[PDB]
Amino acid sequence: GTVPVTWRLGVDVGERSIGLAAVSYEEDKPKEILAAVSWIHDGGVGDERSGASRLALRGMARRARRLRRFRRARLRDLDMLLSELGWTPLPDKNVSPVDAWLARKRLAEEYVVDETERRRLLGYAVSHMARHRGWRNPWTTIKDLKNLPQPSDSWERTRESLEARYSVSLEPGTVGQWAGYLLQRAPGIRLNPTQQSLSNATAFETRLRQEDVLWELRCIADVQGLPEDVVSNVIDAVFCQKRPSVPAERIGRDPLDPSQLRASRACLEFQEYRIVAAVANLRIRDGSGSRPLSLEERNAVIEALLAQTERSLTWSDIALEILKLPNESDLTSVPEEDGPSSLAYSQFAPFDETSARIAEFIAKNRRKIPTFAQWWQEQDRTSRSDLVAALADNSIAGLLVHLPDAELEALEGLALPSGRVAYSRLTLSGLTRVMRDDGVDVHNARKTCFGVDDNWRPPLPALHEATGHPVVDRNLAILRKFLSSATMRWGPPQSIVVELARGASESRERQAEEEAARRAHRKANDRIRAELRASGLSDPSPADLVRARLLELYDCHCMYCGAPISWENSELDHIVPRTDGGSNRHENLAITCGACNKEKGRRPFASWAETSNRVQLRDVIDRVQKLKYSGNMYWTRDEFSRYKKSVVARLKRRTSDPEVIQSIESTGYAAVALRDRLLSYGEKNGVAQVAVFRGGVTAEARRWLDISIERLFSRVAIFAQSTSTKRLDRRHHAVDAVVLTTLTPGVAKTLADARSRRVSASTEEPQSPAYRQWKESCSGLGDLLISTAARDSIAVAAPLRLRPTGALHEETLRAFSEHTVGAAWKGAELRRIVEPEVYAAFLALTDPGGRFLKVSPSEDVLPADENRHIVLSDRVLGPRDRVKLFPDDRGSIRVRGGAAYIASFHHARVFRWGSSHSPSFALLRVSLADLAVAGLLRDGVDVFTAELPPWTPAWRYASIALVKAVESGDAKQVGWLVPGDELDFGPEGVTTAAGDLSMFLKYFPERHWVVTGFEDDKRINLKPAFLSAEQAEVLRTERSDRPDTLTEAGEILAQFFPRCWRATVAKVLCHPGLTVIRRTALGQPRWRRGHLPYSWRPWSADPWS
RNA sequence: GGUAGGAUGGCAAGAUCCUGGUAUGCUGGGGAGCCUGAAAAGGCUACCUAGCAAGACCCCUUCGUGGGGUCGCAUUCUUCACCCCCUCGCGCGAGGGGGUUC
DNA sequence: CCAGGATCTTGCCATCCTACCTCT
Ligand SMILES: [Mg+2]
Ligand SMILES: [Mg+2]
Ligand SMILES: [Mg+2]
Ligand SMILES: [Mg+2]
Ligand SMILES: [Mg+2]
Ligand SMILES: [Mg+2]
Ligand SMILES: [Mg+2]
Ligand SMILES: [Mg+2]
Ligand SMILES: [Mg+2]
Ligand SMILES: [Mg+2]
Known part of the structure; x- marks a missing residue:
């Protein structure tokens, strides 16, 4: 079976593709292209308009399901509480639209004297508040919600705007009171903003918060005089919220200790580890050389960094006041980027951050937690570290001291530095102890504490292990199929070549502006971070940094309409939205007011500003363009300019164009993860080495081996000047992989130098031995690629989606149409009958000796009979009675009392009838709803051959010739065709x-x-x-x-x-020599019929068994 | 030494999900206002309410076409078939995953 | 949209390790 030869594997990853080559070799020269193939995957994308992956869509759908289930359970618990209290919940029907709002308004305004009426109004109000409660931070408890200032500043600003807009002042002015007043005064007023698509305004402009509804509930309980335990139970039932959780399998494992979870950044072991490792990497000047710090200097600097409350010790302070050096510059190897006026020495040294947070929390809350303050001063660092680990891992889905419950709530409300680190808590404590006692660095501490050698590398994932990243998983699945097939064909590879998505061929001014940009970003992010810790935001996320940046930049106004905004009611609108593919880059983020964000919605900004009467396009573009540079902001001069142009270009678009910037992260992740799993395969299978080369080394190798994709595949020019890129032909990924199989590191260095010379703006051949042996080895590579491409041995293939999983129908439910039994029946109305047995009865009326509906969409099939009684299997319809019909004449199924269109077709079943000399062809286009309503979405079903009933939309909207041929018993299925x-x-x-x-x-x-x-019944x-x-x-x-x-x-x-x-099905399936090609992993067509999809000729395909 | 890779820590810019919420929307049931109406019923603007993939599995029950709980759009050669890995881990055929060369 | 958790990439700074080529 196996024919072992010496061959090399080339792996060229891409965002929507991967090129894989198996090239058999000689002592240094290629011998034969064993297999070269470009595999075109979707990158996991199941939302082609939005770019969101199938996994992302499934996750959002699952989370919406979980939200609805938890909401239903919470509302049932509320209904049980209201039944206990004797309060009547708001009924499902036969009540006024404003009954709940007027209930809330009246209970906020005056004391209801009537007992049953007060209980009914309280039940109406409380049930309505549970249905519409507003938003709160899900990580904050209900006690934290009670601790919030009531009402919020958003509702106070909204109430001030409402009193200005309507010239009245309601007291105390709750949400239900204002909503009831506006719904009675100006009927038909919308409360919250919605997407624009003759027009009107809305009552409220900001997002409702849970403290507003809570404050309204407290005001109602104060007016009505409810008991405190009653209203506390009501608040617990209304504002109940499941806390967010982290699954433990989502946390990576320690490489040195593979059983243990990676430690959090909050751990004091990690804070000590970071301090000791930073000190251990410092050097001290000694006569044009550098020395590591001696053990007493290590101890002095480490104790000065541990015994610290704030960022008070610069590297200059470490050099001067701690190390007692004569000069600041004697401290070498400072771990910062250098700049003017000794910027790296002006950067701050690390400290014990969790201990600073806990000490500052104690200093602000001495009276709140004095027992914890005494206990924290009492304990040693081991029990302190166990406490901190418990406080950090409370968020894991799956406190050692009898603390009071208020102290427990305050401790779980403490904010700690989040994020995982590389090692576990035990590993970090061991490494820290070895570095402190032996005076060594991290590498020697790892060698001591674990017995590893100098060649030790962390364990790598295997090829069968996925990453959870969709693009990486697509590339990895294709790679492991190719590698398994190639290993069983030609044995294991001799070496494996992967191309990493890394580049460095930049000019010195590009490096200079990137360094200055990094300096400006770090300086402004540090200042904004200090402002947010002063403002209470302990751990500012990048979203918080962007929000504070744009609040500073536009003077706390909305970017679109100019309304004043706060931190809490502003929204970071994606200018190109997520459903149009927009990214989280800060040029795509605009600071808004929430009302502008909701009214814009998923529309382009220029079209929204044209349609809307709230914002103007020229005013927004002008307000962006008059932003002026200042002393110290986040951008440089050129970065501020390019930020303004990119923001304006995002604001100017009118159609739903694709996003400008594409994800290079998944390219680099696919290359790195595939390299790690190929290294695991090489360790298992005796592969000599796994080599990596840059993105720009393969192209320079190809241009110096007289190989161009236009000349290789007889492509033509598609530009008037110069020659186009090599990406016109899809086979260039496999050619890149073939070229990758040739590369060695010295040649890689010389081609990188040649590329750096060329992009450093003819042509000098690179001067090195390794280039000369590479050219003498690879002189025949051009002839080999020409001979391979001439026979079309290079394949471009797309992997098949054969599983019947995904969206069964389109999302929007549609109202049923209706048609009288004893009236005129056309073909489109007969094809739209919802009930399958009513449908079959109408087919029995039109054609008793038939099972299908062979009628034209326009012809009048049944005449208007006043004595037509459709006899069902269990009923008799009247001629006056009406039938539920699908709204439009396309494939539809009934979903939850409504109609939904079927989704994209899973496959087409190919039918061939007629004579053998001139056959006729058709497609039975089968969707996922077809298999769903046919009961085929279960175990043990071949979805491409399992029979569908005639009432499914597949057989309902099949072609008339196909229907007549299956009726005549001449059309048998000969194959299937997936997209x-x-x-x-x-x-x-x-x-x-x-x-x-x-x-x-x-x-x-x-x-x-x-x-x-499969666009319609006669088109592919x-x-x-x-x-x-x-x-x-x-x-x-x-x-x-x-x-x-x-x-x-x-x-x-x-x-x-x-x-x-x-195309046209009966035309294209009758070509002589047409073959539906199903390929193996090596790009070769699978012809032997086994238990995998095989190739088949539609003209001569034998019928299905 | 220089290039390349890997570790760790920091900084910067991003990507990918996951958990919990908000608000909208759709469909069914309603109806506050307005309009066209009325011997002659529908729309409009909101708001209220239930559901929001089809469905599957477990438990009820002081027996029902329902109450309660856990799930259900990913891993793209479905199912079947053969081999492999981890878990039902006695050289068990039941869950997940992987491969099948032209 | 919101908060916040987890995985990961690229680029620079510091340190350590590896392999590999190029001169003298
Ligand atoms: Mg490439
Ligand atoms: Mg909810
Ligand atoms: Mg709510
Ligand atoms: Mg609204
Ligand atoms: Mg938006
Ligand atoms: Mg490529
Ligand atoms: Mg509503
Ligand atoms: Mg609603
Ligand atoms: Mg359901
Ligand atoms: Mg398979």
């Missing part, structure tokens, strides 16, 4: 071109076509396999940059894409 199946038209190409395809084939003779969809959507789609996107964008940068072939490609080939 992503490759069609091979043979070496002769395709003949049925006309109009746009004929012009496409004069520049692009494409024989390989990928199914993307095909795109060329070999040509990219993002390439077509950037060509169509770059057409309008200059007056006709493109050539004629570029215009042909841009006017073929993105609709590509809207």
